[PDB]
Amino acid sequence: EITCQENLPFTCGNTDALNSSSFSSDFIFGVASSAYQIEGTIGRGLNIWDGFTHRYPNKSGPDHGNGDTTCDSFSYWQKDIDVLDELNATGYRFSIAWSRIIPRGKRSRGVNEKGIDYYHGLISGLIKKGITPFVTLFHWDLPQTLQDEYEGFLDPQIIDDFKDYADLCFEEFGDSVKYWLTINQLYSVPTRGYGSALDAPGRCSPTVDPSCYAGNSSTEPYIVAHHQLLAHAKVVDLYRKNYTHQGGKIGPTMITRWFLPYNDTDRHSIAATERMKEFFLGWFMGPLTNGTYPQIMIDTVGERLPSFSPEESNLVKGSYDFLGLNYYFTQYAQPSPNPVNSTNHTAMMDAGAKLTYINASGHYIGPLFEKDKADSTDNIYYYPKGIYSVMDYFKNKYYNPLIYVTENGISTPGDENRNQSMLDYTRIDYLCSHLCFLNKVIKEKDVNVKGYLAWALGDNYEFNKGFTVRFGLSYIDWNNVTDRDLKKSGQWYQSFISP
Template sequence: DIFNRGSFDKKDDPFIFGVASAAYQIEGGRGRGLNVWDGFTHRYPEKGGPDLLNGDIACDSYRLWQKDVDVMAELGVNAYRFSLAWSRIIPRGKRSRGVNKDGIKYYSDLIDALLERNITPFVTIFHWDLPQTLQDEYEGFLDREIIKDFKDYADLCFEEFGDRVKHWITINQLYTVPTRGYALGTDAPGRCSPWVDKKCYGGDSATEPYIVAHNQLLAHATVVDHYRKNYAYQKGKIGPVMITRWFLPYDDTQASKDATE
């Protein structure tokens, strides 16, 4: 038997039973500009996991998204959290350089299809896949220029999708890019100190993670403030997603119980 919402559904139950994805992990590279994960997985294929895969094709959801929606409907989910690929909407990073109308249409069609199936979209504006052009020009979140570019990108998203999207996520897991991307070099863009990993193309694990974290918070706050001041009429909610961990005692000893606190 397939597990779905009907397995535990009750009338008027407010519980959100949903699924989630990230653009780079599922869409494939068709029809978008390069992002930092393209550069990272091709530069360091060994860091992509034992299968050495990248997002060039992935699940090809850019082409097969209707089937994704069909599967969600079959599961009976009432929410789908997905991310927008910045480089699909604005291939060259800055809004002033042009907007990809095909990218806008792709996400607009997806949102419409979800709503037709009574699936609420929860939309992540940034899930780590910064356009490669912005990384090349000023090292992305290491420079405060990112704040304006992120605001311009988010503003376009609110303009195009805000009439239907009422749940916005500014940045996914703010902890991850500073630590894994700039302290350890295990995630894109792959920066760290040589003493951490000599393969990193540059970086300073003692300072850059804090700069990136600070600029992420500033970018997040700027976009939230902009949304609340200029798009309140859309009556949506906006915030970040934080990463958390849940620990269970190894055994029934008091020491193990204390360690979980």
């Protein structure tokens, strides 16, 4: 029987009690990254994360930091492989920058052969060290040209441009890459890029944020979500019909959270919790498993929710070989009004729920996850059992999918000095406590999880936070980015993988 801790102190950092041997022999362990966050702009065209961070610098991070140079994995990709090799990792998730291989967005305008070569060298280097690539085609970094021509995922023109981009990736790299991810965290761009305008491209209703250049927070998240699902599905169809000879697998990436009732004896909080599962996970998993949005979304969102044609429904339904599930934290849910007529209405209000980390009796859900210095009542707290709950829910609700955990990690403050940053025991605690629950759910519930990739390989530009927080298992000095030095967490992870 497996027992896992939910509260500090944790004792799962002892590799005598928890290690890779605890899991099936074929289980993949590694780390993850994304292109905007690690490569730098050298050698590529411009994308909407360059555009957003430069047009709205105070949205890029408190330090106004951006991905212009970052950890320079364009130059130091070999050093990333060296970190992986030190870990004895068997998997690495990275993304391809669309703007590095088709800087002009539309494939017919030409490809960047040197960009293609960059990824060929990285892939070859990873395979030479026994590391399985998991490659994300779209980690938010849409070529700026496409956003300027037709507002990117707001328009159905995105579907064929994304399809032609993915075709080029399959053609050039699919002889070596056998695990493909289409779109990173489906929920994120619709809500943060087109709802709150916290993320690129930065569109929203005027009264939500007067800095937005255009938008409508009530309608555009649904349009963009719909186009993401159609673009994803068109790429999966292309993969499975035209690249079956490569013997690989493809899927979307979901951001997952668990939800608990803020008051577990209050039917209204219980109902808000179930609505959050549908509006946060079902928004995408309904279409991916059934070709339709959840009924509560149909009913609430009404004319603002697009319909799938029969052909579209068929395309989307079943459009995955596996799911990449990212998981960071869980929230309590309580009822909240949905003021659809308010000029500041957002799609996120349609779930009729307010989300917290503290429940009605004052209990904080778990240990600190992210401190908010401007506002400590906005601190985020984590919940190790949430990974168990999420995976169990996916197996039961969503037809026993094949899953890879494609991100899981925690930040530490950028104000810490190097010595403090390397002594990242809070990261060991976070990662081990989740891995314990992951092993427990696989054993107890027989969820088909076959790998785990921790966020992140190294310190990098964090969306929205610049360099004010660090997520790496390896440390990068921003005054001299060449080296990636394993922190205590990376050293622990090395021992967990090879105990």
